[PDB]
Design a protein around this ligand. Structure first.
Ligand SMILES: [Mg+2]
Ligand SMILES: [Mg+2]
Ligand SMILES: [Mg+2]
Ligand SMILES: [Mg+2]
Ligand SMILES: [Mg+2]
Ligand SMILES: [Mg+2]
Ligand SMILES: [Mg+2]
Ligand SMILES: [Mg+2]
Lengths: 240, 93
RNA sequence: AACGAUAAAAGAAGUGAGAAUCUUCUUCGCCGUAAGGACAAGGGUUCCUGGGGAAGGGUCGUCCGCCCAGGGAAAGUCGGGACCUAAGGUGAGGCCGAACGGCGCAGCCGAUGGACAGCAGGUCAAGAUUCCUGCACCGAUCAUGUGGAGUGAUGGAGGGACGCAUUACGCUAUCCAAUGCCAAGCUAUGGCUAUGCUGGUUGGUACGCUCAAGGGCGAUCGGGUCAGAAAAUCUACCGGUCACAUGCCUCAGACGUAUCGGGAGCUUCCUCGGAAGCGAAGUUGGAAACGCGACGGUGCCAAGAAAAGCUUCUAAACGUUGAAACAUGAUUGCCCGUACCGCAAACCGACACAGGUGUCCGAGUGUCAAUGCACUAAGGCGCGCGAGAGAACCCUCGUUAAGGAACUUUGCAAUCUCACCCCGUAACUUCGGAAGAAGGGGUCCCCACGCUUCGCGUGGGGCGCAGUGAAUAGGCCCAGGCGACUGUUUACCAAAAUCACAGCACUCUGCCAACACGAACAGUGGACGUAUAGGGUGUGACGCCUGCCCGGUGCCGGAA
RNA sequence: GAAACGAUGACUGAAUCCGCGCGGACCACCGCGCAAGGCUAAAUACUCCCAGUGACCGAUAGCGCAUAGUACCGUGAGGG
RNA sequence: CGAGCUGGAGAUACGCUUUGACUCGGGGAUGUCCGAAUGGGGAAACCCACCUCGUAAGAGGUAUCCGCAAGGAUGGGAACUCAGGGAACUGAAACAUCUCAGUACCUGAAGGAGAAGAAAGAGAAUUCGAUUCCGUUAGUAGCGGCGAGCGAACCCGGAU
């Protein structure tokens, strides 16, 4: 609703359908969100209003800084219009404050967590997601991620106080095909409804199934798709 | 130059009736422009042009001999002069 | 066999070697939300005139969209360009790759979008918002005066700038009525003698102490640098002062005066028919847009392009002795498009083909409404063989005694039913439905009385076999299978019980995500998303539920 | 293959003339030769074109064409 | 060259030519716009510019890659040449190594030719004396699911 960009639809890369499905949609505009917040250290901002944001799930908050620079931030669960928000290491454990993990107390619930100092927020961004802090190790802090995974994130990285907005994606029951169309194209086309050519679940005489695999080769219910990577050392306890 | 550009005068009955109103019509170089065409008439005939309207025109005959045919491609320029009209005497043709 | 829709055709006159077919006159009939009219695409001279008459034309041609020659096409303002950007294309530098090449920031190209100055008429045989007459407008260079000092970017900001449904007030295009006005005459068959009949009944521009719904708006001073790279007198933010109604600003349109125009028709000439000259009236009442006022109001979630033009700021620069802005004169006005066909005999369909083709306008009467249906204006057309006959049979129709499904694979087909108003209406239910359930009644004309109309209600009376009097116009019900539902499919034998679906589950994926395209340590999709997210696989609304077996196979896990 | 020798993508890596490489694993002897720099005419090949000739054709032959890559077909490549 | 000419053109009119037309042989001079295409754009043959000289007409320039600069490169060639990349039908009476074949095709570079070339060689006479080509050795030697089948070189004769 205030100084945004044009998000143009596209589901194919260099030419080909690369992410299966994906189509319809109500033609949305892009709102730039301050995911990092570092440069606004020390400066206080007023919550002008909580706006609607397609592209997200998390409600959007319009910040009116004292220096008159306007920015958008993911609205946390609780933040009301006419409240103050401050960025920088100097920050209270109050809603919407941006403060690095070292200054963040243990047992605290956070969202919009970084991964590398800078870049911007990368974890717990969608509505109702929380990061439970477990307690410091060195430069690194052990954190509980929305999945249940415990990661070693260095205290040098920012976070925002509280859980994400838009309360609950529950009473949202879609309703009918076509509600799903206001967003993404004729969903999941069963490979069992396909032909031998098209997919491995193709063919046979009637309704069936025989070895359980995806579109291309592989296998689908249980198969560690994660690789033998370096980011593994900075990670302790995964599953559930 | 001046003397080129205007290939020939428009014959017909409509041009000859326009002649009588101090309106002169010519077959000009297709590439020639309004400014260039106005200049050449103003010069070669010694008369001020108060207005120029112009437009391009195609071709395409054959009579016999399955010799495909071909266009010819012209441009016709029609000019109006102030009260001090007339071209040479080459108007009452 | 056929001569390409069952929308007809008749006679007269003409022309010519020759006439069902060409011209002309009078009729007839078909379309009329089109079978009329205006674009766009596309085609290319098919247009107009004069000639022709081999072949093309399903027949015939004297004719033609065919053949020959000549002509016709006119723009500062309409489309496009010399302006802008979207998807996409390209792309110095740059990132990759046996080669050829693939990617890619800015930038540039790219309308289907933004932006931007002209209207009313006239008329060639054939053009017209282009020519012509009338009176406007836009920008540029200079001149003469007003004026007296800034002007303000390749960068800042504002602004351009955007959805869907619904809806209040005002109006216009436009349409109706009349014993309003103006004009022409005459009518007689029985009557009317005009209060009958026909036709016309206002477009542009300028000004106006005239009416006017609607619509748009804050103005200023100051503070903080931590914001717009910097600067800013511009913008944002915070604070102070007057921000009810109002108050300013804007007039859609109406009215009036003027003026240019047009106007039914009349007047003369007539070389077979056109040219020229003249010109009346301009009422009251009713209806009324998808257009205009306008960026109105409300509601809603699926949350509704960009960039330039523009308006406001300073930087640098020239200049403050000739600034910007205004006013009036002159000058200037580039390139491409414009004929014609354009729901079609000129485009795509091998044909002058019963198909297909995007947008706009699309009158009247009747009928709740309407772009429906019937008839009909304007306009266009009778579909490029014809004439007899009145057999079998075949196609498309009308009626049908008595019976009424007995037909048959199957009521397939074809009837019945049919609109609006009133009464009335079941099991069953997700309490919405089922429902137009089922069933029954009314419907026309005249008069009188009442009211809320275009019309309606009550009373009495009339006519016919019959009153949605013709056209458009549900047959209904009981029980089951399957699939919850709307939707989607085999262009061209399958429309479904197929697929999809909302919902449920298993599962993988911690972000240079899994997964996918790829020559590639390129690049991109996933995603400018982040586990309330994304991939895969299955089941398939909702309700109650989903048991037993882990030997084989697969997946996750341990390791003597 | 008993597979020498050339060649090189990956890893390594020497000698310098009582020195190096070769002689079809490999050794010794006998013998042939000097890599890790570059050029180099002629003899060879082909025929768009030109001339000459022919137990080559003479209009369904000969080139697709007595000339046309036209007419015609196809969105196009192409075909003809 | 020495009288005709005015293209095919079967066509009339106007003319030209012994002060030597016409034609033929050899040079020049003009050569619109597109095309490597090269100012910028572009849907080839069209739009739109700027800079220098200039009385307007009009003339010249404005692409990237090499190098100081002179000067060179882009693009086109029927087949032939070398290079990078490289099929399958087919044979094997099936097929998989093998064959077809490093053929066809694509791509690069070039010329009238190219390629190759001046022995760390051939090779068994202590012969030879750069390369290419032709005959020959020779279907020998050998390779080979030892199958289908594939197939050298030295000597010698010869072109140069
Ligand atoms: Mg791009
Ligand atoms: Mg008949
Ligand atoms: Mg008889
Ligand atoms: Mg049953
Ligand atoms: Mg169904
Ligand atoms: Mg359905
Ligand atoms: Mg013969
Ligand atoms: Mg030829």
């Amino acid at each position: 609703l205030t100084e945004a960009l044009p998000k143009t639809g596209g589901r194919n890369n260099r030419g080909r359908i690369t992410s299966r499905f994906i189509g319809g949609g109500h033609k949305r505009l892009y709102r730039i969100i301050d995911f990092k917040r570092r440069d606004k250290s020390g400066v206080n901002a007023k919550v002008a209003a909580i706006e609607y944001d397609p592209n997200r799930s998390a409600r959007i908050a319009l910040l009116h800084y004292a220096d008159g620079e306007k920015r958008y931030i993911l609205a946390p669960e609780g933040l009301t219009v006419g409240a103050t928000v401050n960025a920088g290491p100097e920050a209270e454990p109050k809603l919407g404050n941006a403060l690095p993990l070292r200054f963040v107390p243990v047992g605290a619930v956070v969202h919009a967590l970084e991964l590398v100092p800078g870049k911007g927020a990368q974890l717990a961004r969608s509505a109702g997601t929380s990061v439970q802090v477990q307690g410091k190790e060195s430069d690194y802090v052990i954190v509980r991620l929305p999945s249940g995974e415990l990661r070693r994130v260095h205290s040098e990285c920012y976070a925002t106080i509280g859980a994400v907005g838009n309360a609950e994606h529950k009473n949202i029951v879609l309703g009918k095909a076509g509600r799903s169309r206001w967003l993404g194209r004729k969903p999941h086309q069963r490979g069992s409804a396909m032909n031998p050519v098209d997919h491995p679940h193709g063919g046979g005489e009637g309704r069936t199934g025989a070895g359980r695999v995806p579109v291309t080769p592989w296998g689908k219910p249980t198969k560690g798709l994660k690789t033998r990577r370096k980011r593994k050392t900075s990670d302790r306890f995964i599953v559930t | 130059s001046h003397y080129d550009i205007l290939q020939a005068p428009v014959i017909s009955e409509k041009a000859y009736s326009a002649m009588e109103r101090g309106v002169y019509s010519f077959w000009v170089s297709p590439k020639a422009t309004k400014t260039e065409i106005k200049d050449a008439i103003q010069q070669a005939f010694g008369v001020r042009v108060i207005g120029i309207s112009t437009m391009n025109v195609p071709g395409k005959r054959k009579r016999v001999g399955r010799f495909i045919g071909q266009r010819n491609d012209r441009k016709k320029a029609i000019v109006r002069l102030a009260e001090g009209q007339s071209i040479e005497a080459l108007a009452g043709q």
